[PDB]
Design a protein around this ligand. Sequence first.
Ligand SMILES: OC[C@H]1O[C@@H]2O[C@H]3[C@H](O)[C@@H](O)[C@@H](O[C@H]4[C@H](O)[C@@H](O)[C@@H](O[C@H]5[C@H](O)[C@@H](O)[C@@H](O[C@H]6[C@H](O)[C@@H](O)[C@@H](O[C@H]7[C@H](O)[C@@H](O)[C@@H](O[C@H]8[C@H](O)[C@@H](O)[C@@H](O[C@H]9[C@H](O)[C@@H](O)[C@@H](O[C@H]1[C@H](O)[C@H]2O)O[C@@H]9CO)O[C@@H]8CO)O[C@@H]7CO)O[C@@H]6CO)O[C@@H]5CO)O[C@@H]4CO)O[C@@H]3CO
Length: 476
Amino acid sequence: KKLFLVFWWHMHQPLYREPYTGEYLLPWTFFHAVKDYYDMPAYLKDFEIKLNFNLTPVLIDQIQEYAQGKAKDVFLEAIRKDPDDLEKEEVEKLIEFTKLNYEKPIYRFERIRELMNKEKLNREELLDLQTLNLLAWCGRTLRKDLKDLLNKGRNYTQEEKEYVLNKYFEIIKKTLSIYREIKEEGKGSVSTSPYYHPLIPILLNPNCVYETTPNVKIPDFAVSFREDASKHVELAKEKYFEIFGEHPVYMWPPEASVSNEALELYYEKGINMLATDEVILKNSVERASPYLRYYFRELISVFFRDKTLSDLIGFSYHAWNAEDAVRDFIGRLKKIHESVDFQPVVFVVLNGENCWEYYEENGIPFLEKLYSTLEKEEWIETLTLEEAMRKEDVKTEVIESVKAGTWFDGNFLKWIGNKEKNEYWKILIEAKKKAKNDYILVAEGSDWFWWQGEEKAPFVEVFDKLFRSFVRRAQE
Ligand SMILES: OC[C@H]1O[C@@H]2O[C@H]3[C@H](O)[C@@H](O)[C@@H](O[C@H]4[C@H](O)[C@@H](O)[C@@H](O[C@H]5[C@H](O)[C@@H](O)[C@@H](O[C@H]6[C@H](O)[C@@H](O)[C@@H](O[C@H]7[C@H](O)[C@@H](O)[C@@H](O[C@H]8[C@H](O)[C@@H](O)[C@@H](O[C@H]9[C@H](O)[C@@H](O)[C@@H](O[C@H]1[C@H](O)[C@H]2O)O[C@@H]9CO)O[C@@H]8CO)O[C@@H]7CO)O[C@@H]6CO)O[C@@H]5CO)O[C@@H]4CO)O[C@@H]3CO
């Protein structure tokens, strides 16, 4: 009697490439590529477990552009430059970027503390601010190759900074190839999402927000987004086919977001399985074990992720010592294993790249001990998505209806409902009426709506500039 464990790491970045300049206005795709996007599947080179990944098509596009040397990244060019060439604006952005990340364990260099406490910074000190910002984002693989430069911690030279940059781009050039390798070797399944990570239930039917939050106020949806919803799925199938040579049969719905109508659309588009959140299941069915494989109207398979286990990794364990975290996690799986007489299916689903910067040493002690301990347990079998979908010694249930929602509280409040978020929607609506190209799809990305209506942060105006730029480009 086994416990079936399914990791599904979700990887996504909105499009940071401003369409009129062609400049990546924020370096987050670059930094999560050198840190997480190659390195998370690369664990499968050293650990005999199965791990699954979701890659949004918008993120693949950007990875492709950095790998080909075509991405113009404004923050990165400030890193690359000799400090005597830096503009005041670039020094300010570099300082600003440092203090935004200052308290994260991956930024714990004593030299950073010194530089931050300083007045003007000289050339040698600016070189250390440049290179320490680079090295802070170093992934598992290169933390070994560059071990001597990391321990240096100070007094970097331009030639060392450039050495680091070269190795970083070699990692990006390797990144799509390793997803294809782990997929081919049977070590994991790779899924994708609708192209630009939109909220499909809202695009299909904005009134679905009233299934959970009846008092919410939303704008006048005077145009249809239903065919755009199909295009996000269709175009995602094409990009996935280009990269992996098949149409995708698994998708991760952005924000775990599902509705009756979105489930039908995914079925119509050839998706045979997805996952969503335990809160959705609880809202939808009285009798709700998340350890079953569900079938929505016998049309499509649906797993409901284990919220607590997913939140332990994403919310709790950054604050723990790795050993104590791993023993806690294994203990919890053991109680699940002992809590049922059948073989449960346990889906651990979260973002694969955002929680590790808050762990000591980028979560590497945690994940290396987690994966090493998992591969030791005879009563745990980790599954690819393909295996979880076809596994026969698993218990099963049909579900006929779901209450539309997301994995944020089971509702849509974080993307629609207040004055500022609603304004983005009205802008989108008006613009959809005048749209002439696919940049309107870019503007339908969830991320724009998330950041709006709650600014208060360093760099959030960049997301607003991107959204409005895409909205403007869509009408030309
Ligand atoms: O759009 C850009 C980003 O896109 C991508 O993200 C999307 C995901 O892909 C998508 O799946 C989804 O994510 C959901 C997520 O998976 C769920 O976990 C949840 O989010 C919760 C989160 O995980 C929790 O941490 C918690 O957050 C609280 C936190 O606990 C608390 O400490 C505090 O946060 C402060 C931080 O501690 C501090 O770091 C800082 O935050 C800064 C940040 O440091 C800084 O770097 C910058 O963030 C960058 C980010 O680093 C970049 O990588 C890039 O992000 C993209 C992701 O990489 C994608 O995967 O751009 C960001 C913006 O520049 O700026 C931050 C500003 O604050 O200060 C923090 C201020 O809070 O508070 C929080 C809140 O309680 O709970 C979260 C839920 O509230 O739900 C997600 C949405 O459903 O959506 C992603 C966004 O679109």
